[PDB]
Amino acid sequence: GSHMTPKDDEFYQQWQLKYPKLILREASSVSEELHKEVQEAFLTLHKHGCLFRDLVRIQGKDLLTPVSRILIGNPGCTYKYLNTRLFTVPWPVKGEAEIAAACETFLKLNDYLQIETIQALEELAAKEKAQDEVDIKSRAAYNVTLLNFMDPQKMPYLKEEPYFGMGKMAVSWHHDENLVDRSAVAVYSYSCELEGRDPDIWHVGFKISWDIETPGLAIPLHQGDCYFMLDDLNATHQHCVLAGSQPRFSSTHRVAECSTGTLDYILQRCQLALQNVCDDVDNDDVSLKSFEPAVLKQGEEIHNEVEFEWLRQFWFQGNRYRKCTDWWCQPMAQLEALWKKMEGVTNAVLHEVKREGLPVEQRNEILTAILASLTARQNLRREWHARCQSRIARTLPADQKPECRPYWEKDDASMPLPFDLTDIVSELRGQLLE
Numbered sequence: 001g002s003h004m005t006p007k008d009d010e011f012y013q014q015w016q017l018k019y020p021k022l023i024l025r026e027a028s029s030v031s032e033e034l035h036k037e038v039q040e041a042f043l044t045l046h047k048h049g050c051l052f053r054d055l056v057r058i059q060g061k062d063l064l065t066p067v068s069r070i071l072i073g074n075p076g077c078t079y080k081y082l083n084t085r086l087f088t089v090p091w092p093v094k095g096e097a098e099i100a101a102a103c104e105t106f107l108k109l110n111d112y113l114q115i116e117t118i119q120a121l122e123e124l125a126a127k128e129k130a131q132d133e134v135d136i137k138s139r140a141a142y143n144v145t146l147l148n149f150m151d152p153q154k155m156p157y158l159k160e161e162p163y164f165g166m167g168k169m170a171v172s173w174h175h176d177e178n179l180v181d182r183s184a185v186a187v188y189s190y191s192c193e194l195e196g197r198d199p200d201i202w203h204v205g206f207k208i209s210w211d212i213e214t215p216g217l218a219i220p221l222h223q224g225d226c227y228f229m230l231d232d233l234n235a236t237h238q239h240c241v242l243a244g245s246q247p248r249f250s251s252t253h254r255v256a257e258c259s260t261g262t263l264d265y266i267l268q269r270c271q272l273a274l275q276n277v278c279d280d281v282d283n284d285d286v287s288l289k290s291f292e293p294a295v296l297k298q299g300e301e302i303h304n305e306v307e308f309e310w311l312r313q314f315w316f317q318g319n320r321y322r323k324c325t326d327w328w329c330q331p332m333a334q335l336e337a338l339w340k341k342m343e344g345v346t347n348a349v350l351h352e353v354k355r356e357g358l359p360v361e362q363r364n365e366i367l368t369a370i371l372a373s374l375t376a377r378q379n380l381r382r383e384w385h386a387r388c389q390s391r392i393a394r395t396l397p398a399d400q401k402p403e404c405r406p407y408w409e410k411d412d413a414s415m416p417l418p419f420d421l422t423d424i425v426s427e428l429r430g431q432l433l434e
């Protein structure tokens with residue numbers, strides 16, 4: 001197939017018929033007072049070195065993103081994409097000074113794009129007509145924004161768009177992951193400076209999923225243009241970013257699905273796991289109230305959740321968040337402290353199964369409940385330790401080198417359990433034999 005730009009006559013009627021949920025608001029519809037503030041906050045964060053390339057994993061291989069990113073949003077929120085959890089630099093919601101001011105700026109932009117999204121969603125329902133104001137308000141209540149930056153001149157060879165001849169790509173075809181169902185997405189595009197598409201100007205591409213026969217749209221983006229993906233547009237269509245010649249910033253505001261991705265959620269989950277622990281005093285004499293299989297199953301699953309979805313995800317970035325804010329320092333230290341107690345809980349469970357007065361039928365009730373969690377813990381620890389010690393992981397500079405936290409040697413006597421669980425896991429399976 002091919003692609004369509006405003007240079008083509010059919011481009012405008014294709015937008016009307018098959019992309020009505022895509023809205024474009026040109027820079028002339030936004031106050032200059034806002035343009036100057038947002039564009040200066042972009043350069044303020046870039047000068048302070050607040051945008052970083054992520055070391056994600058796709059299909060078993062570790063990739064460095066061509067785009068530099070920083071997440072800004074509600075305090076305690078997270079956004080997960082490509083197996084990498086991003087932690088928000090907080091913006092002032094009611095209840096390092098130049099950096100704070102930038103976050104206030106993007107909170108102000110968040111309010112504006114929110115009102116614009118609600119109005120565009122109200123016009124869409126009226127056009128389709130000829131309780132739900134709750135759904136419209138929720139699908140527009142952006143909680144985070146993910147800032148992006150790329151200098152196209154820094155890349156030796158940019159990937160070509162492979163289906164419609166759209167030219168060089170900065171971000172390939174994808175859907176935005178981890179969004180509330182049918183939630184909108186607003187993007188502020190800030191570009192720094194005849195056969196088909198102008199390769200010098202940045203574009204955003206659009207196509208139908210599974211469809212390379214239907215020609216896709218290349219929407220040119222100038223300095224200050226905003227486009228909106230409404231309702232199920234993010235699900236039924238893929239989008240990409242077509243690279244220009246000059247660098248470009250972008251602020252993509254989303255309604256992240258954070259039902260299992262807020263600090264409050266994971267702290268409650270930790271408290272629920274420690275309800276099985278005599279919490280009179282904090283020492284190594286960990287005594288568990290119950291040994292009922294489902295309570296122990298729940299305990300070791302929460303143990304895996306805090307370790308892998310939060311601890312190792314956070315320190316895999318390597319204290320680079322400590323350049324912009326210290327908001328997560330105390331929480332990450334509290335979750336690590338809570339995690340250490342759960343290590344002693346696992347040791348207390350391993351102590352009970354090796355007790356002489358426990359009947360075999362009760363022992364096998366506990367092994368069946370916890371083996372799947374201990375298997376996943378050992379398997380995920382090997383992957384994470386391999387991610388931190390990969391060849392591409394060394395080439396990063398020192399202030400964002402992945403730390404395999406938490407990590408300890410067999411020497412370490414402060415830990416009650418080793419890091420390698422292969423001898424334990426294999427034993428519990430052997431205890432299931434006879």
Ligand SMILES: Cc1n[nH]c(C)c1-c1cc(Cl)c(Nc2ccsc2C(=O)O)c(Cl)c1
Nearest residue numbers: 063064065081170171172173174175176177
């Ligand atoms: C999924 C998703 N949800 N939100 C976002 C912003 C993405 C996303 C999608 C893509 Cl496709 C990329 N791109 C990428 C990464 C490694 S290589 C590469 C490339 O396109 O060459 C990146 Cl960073 C994020």
Ligand SMILES: O=C(O)CCC(=O)C(=O)O
Nearest residue numbers: 148171187204241250252
């Ligand atoms: O930068 C953009 O235009 C938005 C595209 C996108 O999905 C992203 O990189 O967040």
